[PDB]
Amino acid sequence: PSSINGGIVVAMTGKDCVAIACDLRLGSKFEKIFHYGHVFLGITGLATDVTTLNEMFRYKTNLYKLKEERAIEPETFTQLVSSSLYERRFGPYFVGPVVAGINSKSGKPFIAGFDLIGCIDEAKDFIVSGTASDQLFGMCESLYEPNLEPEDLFETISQALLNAADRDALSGWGAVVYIIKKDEVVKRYLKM
């Protein structure tokens, strides 16, 4: 019940939309995806570091909105995450973060991943984080197709998560999926 370390995060890009999904534990709270207005961050790894990073980024994004008088864009948030991670060069957090979002002015979807000291990997297709399943990357590679509609993208990412969960730990596995458009965000739960 108190063991929540680990997990997986999958981010994918469609046509004028993005999808970010994470695994969720069983029933009888701790979700690994957070948002800062219209930028979504999913963190895998040590749970205490995940909570610390979420609190720090909420702090920084609130101050940024108060000063700039506008919400922060995915690229700027990516750079901020990179610099914050690099600050702890010799004591780094045991985390793998993934960022997804849509730029307001341009409408271009954006996803990125980070290493534990902030090296940025900007991918045009998808990002997978976590070490729960080794075949999850292969399943995402086999299922992904460029320029998918939000319904098709949701189906693809949900199928990838379900297939990864089937050949892995079971009896309580759940998923949380976010479909992000320029003006609409949909959050869904998968109990399969």
Binding site: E87, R88, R89, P92, D115, I120, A123
Partner: protein, 209 residues
């Protein structure tokens, strides 16, 4: 202040429980790299830009810890921009070399960045290699990365003093191509940057494929 040492003991307790070339030619310098980015044996990105810009006419490419390379390059670029504004003069490659050398020596090799730096300034064209511990060296042609041996073989095969711009570009492209073919770390594309005296820098993304 500075880089933090917090959670060092905690991390210890938890633990207890690329081809880059640079070529000089008669009126400038050329730097070239491959575009394959890997995370272990997995190809993370088939089109990655490894050529970085310290200043409009001073470029570099690195190996080692990627985050360290990027951070050090950006810090030195900020220092170079401020110094150029302060002196109202074009930045010199020697100044960037001095800043990089002293910064790397301060950290006693704990910043894992190995660099090739090429540039053009009012004093001429310059090419340097920089080691993580702070040692620097000068040369007419340099190679770096896991594919550096094949690229160096190609460079030693077809290098001469009187090289034109086109010959230098072809030689750098061939060295990167050899690293691409014979090294598992490289393979996708070739990025080039040509810095010629008296002209703007020319950045060629995906020069070959």
């Amino acid at each position: 202040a500075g880089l933090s040492f917090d959670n060092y003991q905690r991390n210890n307790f938890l633990a207890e429980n690329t081809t880059i070339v640079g070529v000089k030619f008669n009126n400038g310098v050329v730097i070239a790299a491959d575009t394959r980015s890997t995370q272990g044996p997995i190809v993370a990105d088939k089109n990655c830009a490894k050529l970085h810009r310290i200043s409009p006419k001073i470029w570099c490419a690195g190996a080692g810890t990627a985050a360290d390379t990027e951070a050090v390059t950006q810090l030195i670029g900020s220092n170079i921009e401020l110094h150029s504004l302060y002196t109202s003069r074009e930045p010199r490659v020697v100044s960037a070399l001095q800043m990089l050398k002293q910064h790397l020596f301060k950290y006693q090799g704990h910043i894992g960045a190995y660099l090739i730096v090429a540039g053009v300034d009012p004093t001429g064209s310059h090419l340097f290699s920089i080691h993580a511990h702070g040692s620097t060296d000068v040369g007419y042609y340099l190679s770096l990365g896991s594919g550096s041996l094949a690229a160096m073989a190609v460079l030693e095969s077809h290098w001469k003093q009187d090289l034109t711009k086109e010959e230098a570009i072809k030689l750098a492209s061939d060295a990167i191509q050899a690293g691409i073919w014979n090294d598992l770390g490289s393979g996708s594309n070739v990025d080039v940057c040509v810095m010629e005296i008296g002209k703007d820098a020319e950045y060629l993304r995906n020069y070959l494929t």
